[PDB]
């Protein structure tokens, strides 16, 4: 029932279009049940990984300015404290 | 932002699904599952029915799923035109296309180019390679169901065509897989795609492997299958259309160093909601068109990896007597899927670029770029 | 054998009761010195 | 060059330079075009070609400096720009031409200013006399040295700004205070010569985010004042506010940035972090996904955050292997982390996340390499610093690596690694080590099972596992192994264990399903009636959770095996009534409905399943379509063959 | 307020009883064994209902939806439409034998070969009121499309039935969803519910959508109902293993309020809804085995009936696992107008089909 044998069988077909109907008919249950429910597997299922697996710098999100080639409103102790279009500034918490 | 507008349609062109389309300067050809090769004239006047300038030929009962055309000026005056198709039974067939001066009708003349031994293989894909100063002769490549690739050299000569087998390339894995795709580059490279998500690059001159890409992270055995491989006409880029389970993805690779550049996605990284069926580059190679099972044509900018525009297919876009809104079982064809798509050069469909696609409603549609 | 492995090897219910009966750059720089 | 074409310009310049290899300008222009092409390739995403072009540019620069004995600020700036490519593409940092670089740095005649060298402590002699120095540190030192040799105050200001930028890059990459101090010194020197620069202010503000929030806030305001049409300074202000735990300020700034300049992934990433701080999970996940999608592949922070979020959301969620969407998300995370490793390898957190993701995806071949790299990293870290706390992490990674070998079929290696991990963790007495102990016991038991079928030590390890914890899935696994042994006493003990779990704890579906399967396979017609009556009285919640319909399947099997009639379709009818839009339900009732239910995106289906649905229409057109979808499907080829 | 049982037929069908419907002459039930059963309403004072019962095998896959149309044309018309698990829309004509009162079933072929290739799920008859000249039939398919027909009993009094398709209404969302419930108003409105909690209201006059709504594991819409008089739409939708009822005003689509008892109405899913003739009382059938009657204006519970104990303080009690302490119950419920059922005349009636494969009748006292 190998695919190569089936393809070799196809090669025996020799010469208006017709929509023909196939003649194919569309133990086994025991094998399916054993595979689904009672077969220990080499690879651990997600249920056991759910039990044995444990999950493990702001300067990295910024952009450093590029090099430059030139050849070919309020205040406080001298420091700005409020940005433009804003009303508070910064307050650590 | 490019704009594409419909120019000609033809509904119910074939009696079954149209799986592939190919075009040349003189005409466009399509193949379908009903076993017919249909020729559509490119030199069609405005406001003329494409079906009037049509010619048909019966090839095989099992049906056809691939087609390609090779047209060239071989001698100073000789005209060459060949069509190669693979059937559902696994046969590779060749035909010659000629015309009369009396009535300009197309003549189909069968060619026997394969030897006895080569006829026992089941072929799936095919592709033509024209001579454009890379080598003196034309070439034909094809893949079989056992994972092997075949390379031929075609000699037109007195009319005596011969196919000389240059060699074969076997699959890089054991057990062998299914070779679903193949392509040829101008620089002389061969790309073959497999059903497990593996694509292999080999040299045309020496027939030796160079790269072996894997794009799959699979728990299901064949949930990552490669559907289309396309080489960029100008650069060293390769486009891979593969399957993510329930999705369609396009990945870009560079063939000079063998690196994964990135993926195409619209706002995971997925290009189409359903599986991507076909890919096509334009003449410049700066635009890529993808056909999807979701019934859309999407155009991408290759340089910026960004989508440019989208075309939606409707069954009502067709002559009202050639509209197929329901198939033989009763399913709705309101937004039919697209099987194949192809770019046409300027001056072929009479300037600017043109485009053709075949959809799930047994319709063939032509579009042209505005501007 | 790694230092960690050497150190480690130097340092070295009713449910159950029912079962009873059964790198390069530095090397290059040094070499060129 | 300035418009996009480099291949033609490169060919023109190479042809020009071949017969005129005596003029400095020709080679300098060739170097400039090569550098710009390499940077454009890096921006496009051609990393290997970028490093190849960078190596060629460095060789040409060596030729210029040594053979032609020429010097200029432009070539040094070009070299500094080229050297950044090796740091950015850290996966290829070992291809740095150290010989050419040292020859170039030795062939020059440099005066030397000690004002910056006192804090920098970076010199040619110190770089050459280096012992146990990482590749990245050497690359950063070479970048700083290249920036330092470029010797009304405009040029001096640019020179000091370049030095400060290089020192800031080294400080961010290596995380050492001396580089930060040197960067601050260079920026202070640069500002004293030309204040209206708008980029030395940004660098100064980044350099002193942690030292002083007031100084860092004075910057990013002057920078905005000197140049108002930019979104980077506002993002820096938002990040500074987020570092100082000021959520309202950062949120307001990020909302302003989103309104003014959409299609930029950084504000979305910042808002994702903000929402994650506030205890919101769903909105943070949506923002992370949006930020990842918007950036294509130009941001690795977005890739890392998306992968981490996906792993966090699907690590104790009680998922099933048959969930197609979860597999899609895990595959996307794996690909994103794979692209992340081309620029930032040797990161422990990302490596552990990738190992977990690959373990859940059953990709053990790549997990082996990742685990080997992580083990090497841990060993090198212990060699550098001899803290003994590394043993615990070492043992946990050993348990991970033992789990990896089990899936590859290497049972002896699993036994070895699990024994080592158990030996280290034997003290334990911590909840973190309990999972590792359970994992080691499971691995040892299964390895002894598959290795020559040796059962005594298997039983000992399963006894230890049962003593450590009495869980549902552990009991199911033990029962499965005992049943697979095949002896009568083992089957009896497995059934008894399952029944005692049912008695001691509450009723369950998985244990009931296993008992039903054992009864069906052994054909115990006495217990089958009780199993059937228990399976037909499931509450509504358990039927909602059972989205893959195992209970109706087993009910139909038992019904058809007992009563020998077509009564098993009633459970499927009731399941269809309760869940009419389920793909698994309609398989036994009507295939036309099943085909239409998964046709136009109504349900998520794979190509193989769609091909199977097409071929079941029993006519030539549908069979041809299904074979076109999956030509390797045996049933499609058989149907096509039987058509003729 | 108090409801008293009148008749009870146990083990009436051989499978699940999914739907029930009634008219002035009989009550009709459909089951998963593929049978239609007709129960004569004109029962005696004390008689076993199975004496006046008539069965007919319809389809092998079973039946889950049923509805009956009774009207006087000019002639007595009684027509039953049912839906099969295979997706077939089937029509039967109900007649009475003159001599022996035996019930005769006659199958009708109203759909052409093109229309018989759809998969239908729900259906509903639209009676001819003062606003509507002809009877109408609305049905939904598994792809979310709603179909509207017109029924013509006569030709050009010759009996020649004909179904004329007015048009279709597409689902308001892409990708489409499963259309699970449907209703038609006497004023000329159509409401359609979907499996994801979306409700769409369209216009009968011109067949275009009016507006849309949105109502966590399960969120399916189980039943959409229109008030017999006035502008009111009642929707039964699922919480996570819980039942909810919400009211909408149905002119511009404004939420009015929900029905709740100590915001859920039933411990399990709500299966069906039914307004009475006046529209002032609403009954709910739940998967917890109880029937709850509500006051529409007050929005407060009136009474509760238990299908597991005849004897008749009411709370939503759940166990530690979160499951209801009450066993599974009613599939479907239906009010019967005054005078429809013969007995000791001036009171409303009620019908009920349960998981015990029994059908129960209640009368208000």
Out of C8, C29, C32, name the one closest to residue D391 (CB). C8
Closest by CA to D203, choosing from D171, D161, D172, D155, is D161
Interior/surface letters D413-449, b for 16+ CB within 10 angstroms, e for the rest: bbbebbebbbebbeeeeeeebbebbbbbbbbbbbbbb
Contact A22 D639 (CB under 8 A): yes
H/E stretch holding B71 reads: strand B64-73
A15 touches chain D (CB under 8 A): no
SS3 state at D325: helix
Closest C-alpha to B356, from B370, B366, B368, B346: B366
For chain D, positions 8-47, list CB contacts with chain B under 8 A.
Answer: 44-47
The answer to whether the CB of D596 falls within 8 A of the CB of B326 is: no
Is residue E114 within 8 angstroms of chain B, CB to CB?
yes
CA distance B143 to D297: 34
Find residues 282-341 of chain B whose CB sits inside 8 Å of chain E. 326, 329-330, 332
Instruction: List the single residue in E with minimal CA-CA distance to B330.
Output: E117
Residue that the structure tokens 């040292």 belong to: D102
Q: Of the candidates A7, A15, A19, which has its C-beta nearest B90's C-beta?
A: A7
Which DSSP symbol is given to B53?
Answer: G
Beta-carbon contacts of A7 under 8 Å, excluding residues fewer than 6 positions away, are: B90, B122, B145, D637
Cα separation, B104 vs B43, in Å, equals 12
This structure was determined by cryo-EM
DSSP E34-68: SEEEEEES---SS--GGGGEEEEE--SS-EEEEEE
Resolution (A): 2.8
**Is D631–B254 a contact, with Cβ atoms under 8 angstroms apart?**
no
Interface check D488 vs C, CB under 8 A: no
DSSP B130-182: --SSS-SSEEEEEEETTS-EEEEEEE------EEEEEEEE--SSSS---EEEE
The per-residue DSSP string of B242-279 comes to EEETTEEEEEEEETTTTEEEEE-------SBSS-EEEE
State residue E305 phi and psi, 5-degree precision.
-115, 140
Segment 88-107 of chain E within 8 Å of chain D by CB: none
Cis, bond preceding B102 (omega within 30 deg of 0): no
Token pair 């034909």 is at which residue? B140
Q: Among residues E269, E193, E276, which one has the least CA distance to residue E227?
A: E276
Write down how long chain A is. 93
Strand partners of residue E349:
E336, E363
Those residues whose C-beta lies under 8 Å from the C-beta of residue D517, and which sit 6 or more positions away, are: A33, A34, A36, A37, A38, D554
Residues of D in contact with A31 (CB under 8 A): none
User: Which of E64, E87, E178 comes nearest D592 by C-beta?
Assistant: E87
DSSP D323: -
SS (H, E, C) chain A: CCHHHHHHHHCCCCCCCCCCECCCCCCHHHHHHHHHHCCCCCCCCHHHHHHHCCCCCHHHHCCCCCCCCCCCCCCCCCCCCCCCCCCCCCCCC
**E16, E61, E121 member nearest D580 (Cβ):** E121
CB contact under 8 A, C25 and D98: yes
CA E306 to chain CA centroid, Å, is: 21
- Residue D395: closest CA among chain C residues belongs to which residue? C8
Distance of alpha carbon E174 from alpha carbon E170, whole angstroms:
10
For chain A, how far is it from start to end, CA to CA, in angstroms?
72
Of D361, D604, D630, the CB nearest to B219: D361
Q: Match 């024209």 to its residue by tokens.
A: B130
Tokens of D229: 């049409």
Question: Residue D219 and residue D201: Cα distance in Å, rounded?
Answer: 6
Is residue E282 exposed (0-12), middle (13-18) or buried (19+ Cβ within 10 Å)?
buried
Q: What angle do CA B19, B22, B23 make, to 5 degrees?
A: 155
CB contact under 8 A, D539 and E195: no
Residue D191 in tokens: 């500002």
Half-sphere exposure of D224 (CA within 13 A, CB side): 19
Q: Residue E118: list chain B partners with CB under 8 A.
A: 330
B209 sits in which H/E element: strand B209-214
Contact call for residues A52 and A45 (beta carbons, < 8 A): no
- Picking from D242, D348, D644, the nearest residue to A58 by CB comes out as D242
Q: How far apart are CA E261 and CA E290, in angstroms?
A: 13
Q: With an 8 Å Cβ cutoff, are D327 and B222 in contact?
A: no
Q: Do D390 and C4 touch (CB under 8 A)?
A: yes
Could you give the CA distance from residue E114 to residue D210 in angstroms, rounded to a whole number? 74
Of the candidates D479, D559, D485, D487, which has an alpha carbon nearest to the alpha carbon of residue D525? Answer: D559
Give chain A positions within 8 Å (CB) of B61. 13, 15
- Measured CA to CA, the distance from residue D570 to residue E85 in angstroms comes to 11
CA distances from D634 to B243, B244, D283, D622 (A): 20, 22, 45, 15
Q: How many CA atoms lie within 13 A of E358 on its CB side?
A: 12
Q: Name the closest residue on chain A to residue B145, using Cα atoms.
A: A4
Mutate to test the interface with C, among D422, D463, D478 (most CBs of C within 10 A): D463
Residue D449 phi/psi, 5-degree rounding, is -65, -55
CB count, 10 Å around CB of B218? 18
Please identify which residue in the block is written with the tokens 């890089």. Answer: B172
Q: List % helix, strand, coil for chain E (3-state, nearest 5).
A: 0, 50, 45
Does C contact A via 3+ CB–CB distances below 8 Å? no
Residues of chain C found within 8 Å of residue D391, distances taken between Cβ atoms: 4, 7-8, 11
Structure tokens at E276: 């009475």
Residue B371 to residue B368: CA distance in whole angstroms: 9
What are all long-range contacts of D601-606, with beta carbons under 8 Å and residues at least 24 apart?
A: D601/B273, D601/B274, D601/B294, D601/E174, D601/E175, D602/E143, D602/E175, D602/E176, D602/E177, D602/E178, D604/B246, D604/D324, D604/D325, D605/B246, D606/B220, D606/B223, D606/B245, D606/B246, D606/D324
The DSSP letter of residue E116 is: G
Structure tokens at B359: 């959809």
Q: What gap in Å lies between CA B227 and CA B241, rounded to an integer?
A: 6
Element at E24 (helix H, strand E): none
Does D132 contact chain C (CB < 8 Å)? yes
Q: How far is CA E182 from the centre of its chain?
A: 10
Domains assigned to chain E: 1-365 (2.130.10.10)
CA distance E65 to E30: 7
Two tokens, residue E284? 């709910």
DSSP symbols for B274-295: S-EEEEEE-SSSSEEEEEETTS
Chain D residues closer than 8 Å to C27 by CB? none
Contact of A35 with chain D, judged by CB distance below 8 Å, is answered with: no
**Nearest CB partner across the interface for B62, out of A4, A13, A19:** A13
Give the H or E element holding residue B240.
strand B237-244
Kindly report the nearest CA distance between residue B9 and chain A, in angstroms: 23
Closest-CA residue of B relative to D626 is B17
Burial of D565 (0-12, 13-18, 19+ CB in 10 A): exposed
CA distance E327 to chain D (A): 9
- Residue B11 distance to chain E (closest CA, Å): 20
């Amino acid at each position: 029932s190998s695919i190569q044998e089936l393809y070799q069988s196809l090669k025996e077909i020799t010469n208006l279009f017709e929509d023909r109907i196939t003649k194919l008919d569309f133990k086994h249950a025991n094998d399916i049940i054993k595979d689904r429910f009672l077969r220990p597997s080499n690879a651990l299922p997600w249920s056991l990984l759910d039990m044995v697996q444990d999950v493990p710098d702001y300067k990295e999100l910024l952009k450093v300015p590029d090099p430059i080639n030139r050849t070919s409103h309020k205040d406080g102790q001298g420091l700005f404290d409020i940005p433009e279009g804003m009303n508070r500034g910064i307050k650590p918490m | 932002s490019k704009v594409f507008i419909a120019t000609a349609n033809a509904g119910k062109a074939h009696d079954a699904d149209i799986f592939s389309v190919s075009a040349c300067n003189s005409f466009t050809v399509s193949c379908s599952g009903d076993g017919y090769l249909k020729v559509w004239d490119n030199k069609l006047l405005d406001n003329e029915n494409p079906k009037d300038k049509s010619y048909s030929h019966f090839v095989h009962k099992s049906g056809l799923h691939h087609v390609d055309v090779l047209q060239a000026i071989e001698r100073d005056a000789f005209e060459l035109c060949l069509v190669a198709t693979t059937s559902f039974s696994g046969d590779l067939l060749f035909y010659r296309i000629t015309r009369e001066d009396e009535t300009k009708k197309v003549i189909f003349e069968k060619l026997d180019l394969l030897d006895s031994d080569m006829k026992k293989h089941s072929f799936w894909a095919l592709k033509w390679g024209a001579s454009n100063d890379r080598l003196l002769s034309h070439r034909l490549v094809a893949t079989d169901v056992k994972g092997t690739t075949y390379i031929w050299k075609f000699h037109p000569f007195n009319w005596s065509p011969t196919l000389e087998l240059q060699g074969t390339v076997e699959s890089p894995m054991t057990p062998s897989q299914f070779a679903t795709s193949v392509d040829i580059s101008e620089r002389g490279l061969i790309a073959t795609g497999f059903n497990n998500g593996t694509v292999q690059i080999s040299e045309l001159s020496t027939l030796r492997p160079l790269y072996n890409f894997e794009s799959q992270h699979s728990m299901i055995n064949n949930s990552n299958s490669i559907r289309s491989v396309k080489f960029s006409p100008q650069g060293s880029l390769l486009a891979i259309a593969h399957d993510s389970n329930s999705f369609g993805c396009i990945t870009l690779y560079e063939t000079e160093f063998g690196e994964r550049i990135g993926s195409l996605s619209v706002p995971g990284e997925f290009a189409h909601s359903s599986w991507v069926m076909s890919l096509s580059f334009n003449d410049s190679g700066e635009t890529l068109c993808s056909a999807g099972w979701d019934g859309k044509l999407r155009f991408w900018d290759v340089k910026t990896k960004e989508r440019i525009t989208t075309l939606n297919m409707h069954c009502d876009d067709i002559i009202e007597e050639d509209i197929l809104a329901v198939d033989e079982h009763g399913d709705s064809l309101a937004e039919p899927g697209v099987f194949d798509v192809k770019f046409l050069k300027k001056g072929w469909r009479s300037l600017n670029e043109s485009l053709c696609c075949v959809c799930l409603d047994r319709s063939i549609r032509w579009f042209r770029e505005a501007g | 054998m790694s230092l960690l492995e050497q150190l480690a090897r130097k340092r070295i219910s009713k449910s159950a009761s029912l079962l009873e009966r059964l790198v390069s750059l530095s090397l290059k720089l040094s070499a060129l010195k | 060059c300035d418009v996009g074409e480099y291949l033609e310009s490169l060919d023109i310049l190479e042809k020009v330079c071949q017969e005129a290899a005596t003029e400095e300008s020709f080679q300098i222009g060739l170097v400039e075009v090569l550098m710009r092409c390499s940077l454009d390739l890096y921006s496009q995403g051609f990393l290997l070609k970028s490093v190849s072009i960078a190596k060629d540019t460095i060789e040409r620069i060596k030729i210029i400096i040594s053979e032609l004995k020429c010097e200029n600020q432009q070539v040094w700036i070009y070299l500094s720009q080229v050297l950044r490519l090796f740091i950015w593409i850290e996966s290829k940092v070992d291809t740095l031409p150290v010989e050419s670089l040292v020859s170039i740095f030795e062939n020059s005649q440099f005066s030397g200013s000690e004002e910056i060298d006192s804090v920098d402590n970076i010199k040619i002699d110190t770089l050459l006399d280096s012992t146990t120095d990482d590749n990245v540190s050497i690359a950063c030192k070479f970048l700083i040295l290249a920036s330092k040799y470029s010797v009304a105050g405009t040029v001096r200001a640019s020179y000091w700004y370049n030095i400060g930028i290089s020192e800031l890059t080294a400080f961010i990459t290596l995380k050492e205070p001396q580089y930060r101090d040197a960067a601050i010194f260079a920026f202070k020197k640069s500002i004293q010569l030309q204040s209206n620069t708008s980029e030395t202010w940004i660098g100064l503000g980044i350099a002193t985010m942690d030292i002083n929030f007031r100084v860092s806030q004075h910057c990013f305001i002057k920078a905005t004042a000197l140049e108002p049409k930019a979104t980077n300074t506002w993002f820096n202000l938002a990040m500074l506010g987020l570092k100082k735990k000021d959520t309202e300020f950062a949120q307001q700034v990020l909302n302003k940035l989103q309104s003014l300049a959409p299609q930029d992934s950084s504000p979305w990433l910042g808002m994702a972090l903000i929402l994650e701080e506030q205890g919101d999970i769903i909105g943070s996940s949506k923002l992370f996904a949006h930020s990842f999608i918007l950036s294509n592949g130009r941001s690795k922070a977005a890739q890392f955050m998306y992968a981490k979020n996906v792993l966090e959301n699907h690590i104790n969620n009680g998922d099933d292997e048959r969930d197609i969407e979860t597999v899609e998300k895990l595959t996307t995370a794996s690909i994103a982390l794979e692209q992340f490793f081309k620029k930032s390898p040797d990161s422990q957190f990302a490596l552990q996340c990738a190992l977990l993701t690959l373990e859940r995806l059953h990709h053990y071949e790549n997990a082996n390499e990742l685990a080997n790299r992580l083990i090497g990293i841990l060993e090198k870290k212990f060699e550098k610093t001899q803290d003994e706390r590394e043993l615990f992490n070492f043992a946990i990674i050993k348990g991970q690596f033992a789990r990896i070998h089990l899936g590859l079929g290497n049972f002896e290696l699993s036994i070895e690694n699990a024994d080592l991990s158990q030996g280290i963790i034997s003290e334990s007495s911590d909840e973190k080590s309990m999972k590792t102990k359970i994992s080691n016991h499971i691995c040892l038991g299964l390895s002894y099972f598959f290795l020559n079928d040796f059962d005594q030590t298997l039983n000992q390890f399963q006894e230890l596992l049962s003593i450590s914890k009495d869980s549902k899935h552990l009991v199911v696994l033990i029962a499965k192994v005992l049943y697979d042994v095949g002896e009568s006493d083992t089957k009896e003990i497995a059934l008894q264990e399952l029944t005692e779990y049912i008695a001691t704890s509450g009723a369950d579906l998985l244990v009931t399903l296993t008992i039903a399967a054992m009864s069906i396979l052994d054909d115990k017609r006495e217990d089958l009636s009780i199993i059937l009556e228990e399976l037909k009285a499931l509450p509504l919640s358990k039927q909602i959770i059972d989205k893959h319909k195992d209970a109706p399947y087993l009910i139909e099997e038992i019904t058809k095996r007992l009563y020998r009639n077509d009564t098993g379709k009633q459970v499927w009818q009731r399941s269809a009534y309760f869940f009419p839009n389920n793909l698994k339900v309609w398989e036994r009732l009507d295939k036309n409905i099943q085909r239409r239910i998964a046709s136009n995106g109504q349900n998520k289906v794979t190509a193989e399943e769609m091909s199977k649905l097409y071929c079941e229409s029993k006519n030539l057109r549908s069979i041809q379509r299904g074979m076109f979808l999956c030509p390797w499907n045996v049933t499609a080829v058989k149907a096509l063959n039987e058509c003729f």
